[PDB]
Swiss-Prot record, chains A, B:
It comes from the Bacteria. Belongs to the PqiB family. It comes from Escherichia coli (strain K12). Homohexamer. May interact with LetA in the inner membrane. May also interact with partners in the outer membrane. GO terms for molecular function: identical protein binding. Keywords: Cell inner membrane, Cell membrane, Lipid transport, Membrane, Repeat, Transmembrane, Transmembrane helix, Transport. Forms a tunnel that spans the entire periplasmic space. Is probably involved in the transport of lipids between the inner membrane and the outer membrane through the tunnel. Forms a dynamic tunnel sufficiently long to mediate lipid transport directly between the two membranes without the need for a shuttle protein. Binds phospholipids. Lipids bind inside the tunnel. Required for outer membrane homeostasis. Contributes to membrane integrity. This is Lipophilic envelope-spanning tunnel protein B. The seven MCE (Mammalian Cell Entry) domains of a single protomer of LetB resemble seven beads on a string. Six copies of this linearly configured protomer associate laterally to form a homohexameric assembly. The LetB hexamers form an elongated tube consisting of seven stacked MCE rings, each formed from the association of six identical MCE domains, with a central tunnel. Rings 1, 5, 6 and 7 are dynamic and adopt open and closed states. One of its GO terms (cellular component) is plasma membrane. One of its GO terms (biological process) is membrane organization. The chain holds residues 522 to 877 of 877 of the full protein. Changing residue 190 to N: Loss of activity. Residues 1-104 are annotated as: MCE/MlaD 5. Changing residue 182 to N: Does not affect function.
Length: 356, 356
């Protein structure tokens, strides 16, 4: 479409190496038509599964301390060169269209694989080429942004790399941008100042390939494997996605999502517990809201407790098991509990033996 | 008017490609008169709907890590080149004036379409070329700033791109700049340090094409579709534009705007509720102000509640429905409520069944 590369005479690069030549371009109102020369001993090195991308001029990277000027053929200093490479799923890009298309960047040429669609309410955080990362490892890429004024949403069409398209895009998959959070409590992400991405949490179900972009998503997958109990509450309060679930002050679980009931009288809370602490949850385990700072008072004297709480940052649900000489069976995968509106007075003196 | 491009001999660019030549300029006290050569096989590539823009010298971009020097004809290294392109609505720019005008930048040449006018009280945040963005997608552009000392206001004349001029500019449309907000509560926008823009919320009505620039505007359009009830209060308090409206602690609506009554005894609050939670609002639904931190005290002992509230950030109006064995009908599009001055004591024990 628009490349400042060359009129004629730049070099065809392959894995950043100079073999080939661009011999003819012609401008058009929409898109160039570009003719390349490669050597006859050399035509085996490209096949159907090959993508082409172009760059122009001296690209001085700023990465860390280095400022690397392009050790370039003087062709590229005057007229920007074109690179190419073979890859796995480049056949589907050639099945559409009459011939190959010369992409404007390296990462735009890598965008092959299964193509999903995100329905975001706001594209203020999105960009073309913004990576989709699972556990910090890049699995996908946004390749376009479209505004629809009829349905008030931005449809971002993304691709997933061919290894991950079967494992993801299964429905119940959460997509969310990660924004830098700089507060008085502390900085959470600071790379996302300069390079934002999309965190993704997989799901299990039918291959929908039609998604919406959420607000928050659990970062670590260490709580993905264990049971997913549902906890009923009269109100939400300070509960949110990512709020820790605690046993005796240690973090054993997190709140995955929050929604109302099927009849709107209670807010049910979806939380997951780790595999190591999966056995702590019993059929009789009272839950209560340990949120924020609770300080006491008396008529003859008062004492307070302040503990720089993560509960003050995100109000954590705590639990314990009442003592019984027969132990109740383990809680099932889907089990409904209700909160105690106050902390039980005697759970510090319970000491209920939960083995293994 | 003022371009450092060339005396004679730079190249005419088309989609960043070198076909053509600038053969004659003459200086004048106001504006240059520039004569261009293009090839006779090539004159089909430009028509009436064509805009011209010029740039001068090596433009090293700083975007991210890259510092791309212009892979340029050595003409441009000495004498800056001129580019052009065809587009949709360039006819109206040629209907005015005797001939085409050579713009000083690429984005200034793209400023075509319907021309609105903003009446801002302060141009400290505005600039020429500042984009107007709906849902983060660019729809418009400011092209000039004028100070009037008679009417104490700055008239900024903006353009809207021809796809969006019919959907916007309909009256009841909110324009607002978005400024970076860096506080102890957290950072809200940080791109707008370096690149500010104007958020826009559309409206429905007559094509006014005469606007004023507001202070705050709802960012997301996820609350644009549902009903818009009006809620009456004795005072404003901590209520503002963007304050969430909550059902059982989950956010179901936002306050759109605030104004006084037709006779000044009460402040009425315009709020919109989502489509999913539209059915929760009934004809008997008490509203109360859940703003900030309310802690209790007693003669024999006191207990406090602190919950890192967004209500402390923006004081959210909460609601619930009293129980009745017949359910009242749904609230209409325009319905007037009044706040309860205190929280009802028994809404936690209500549990009013609201189906679907």
């Amino acid at each position: 479409e628009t490349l400042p590369d060359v009129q004629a005479g730049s070099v065809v690069l392959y894995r950043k190496f100079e073999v080939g030549e661009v011999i003819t371009v012609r401008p058009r109102a929409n898109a160039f038509d570009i003719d390349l020369h490669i050597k006859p001993e050399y035509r085996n090195l490209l096949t159907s599964n090959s993508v082409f991308w172009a760059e122009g001029g001296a690209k001085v990277q700023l990465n860390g301390s280095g400022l690397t000027v392009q050790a370039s053929p003087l062709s590229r200093a005057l007229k920007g060169a074109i690179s190419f490479d073979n890859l796995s799923g480049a056949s589907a890009s050639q099945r559409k269209g009459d011939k190959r298309i010369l992409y404007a960047s390296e990462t735009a040429a890598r965008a092959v694989g299964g193509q999903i669609t995100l329905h975001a309410f706001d594209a203020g955080k999105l960009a073309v080429g913004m990576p989709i990362r699972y556990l910090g490892i890049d699995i996908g890429q946004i390749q376009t942004l479209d505004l629809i004024t009829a349905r008030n949403e931005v449809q971002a069409k993304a691709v997933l790399y061919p290894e991950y398209v079967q494992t993801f895009a299964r429905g119940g998959t959460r997509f969310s941008v990660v924004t830098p959070q700089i507060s008085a409590a502390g900085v959470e992400h600071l790379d996302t100042i300069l390079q934002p991405y999309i965190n993704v949490e997989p799901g299990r179900g039918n291959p929908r390939r039609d998604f919406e972009l959420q607000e928050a998503t659990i970062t670590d997958s260490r709580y993905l494997d264990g049971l997913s109990i549902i906890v009923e509450a009269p109100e939400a309060g300070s509960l949110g996605i990512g709020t820790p679930v605690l046993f005796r002050g240690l973090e054993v679980g997190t709140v995955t999502g929050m929604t109302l009931g099927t009849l709107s009288d209670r807010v049910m809370i979806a939380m997951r517990i780790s595999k190591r602490y999966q056995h702590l949850v019993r059929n009789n385990s009272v839950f209560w809201l340990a949120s924020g700072y609770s300080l006491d008072f008396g008529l003859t004297g008062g004492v307070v407790k302040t503990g720089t709480f993560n509960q003050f940052i995100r109000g954590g649900i705590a639990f314990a098991t009442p003592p019984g000489t027969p132990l109740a069976p383990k809680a099932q995968e889907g089990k409904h509990f209700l909160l105690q509106e106050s902390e039980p007075k005697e759970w510090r003196e319970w000491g209920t033996a939960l083995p293994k």
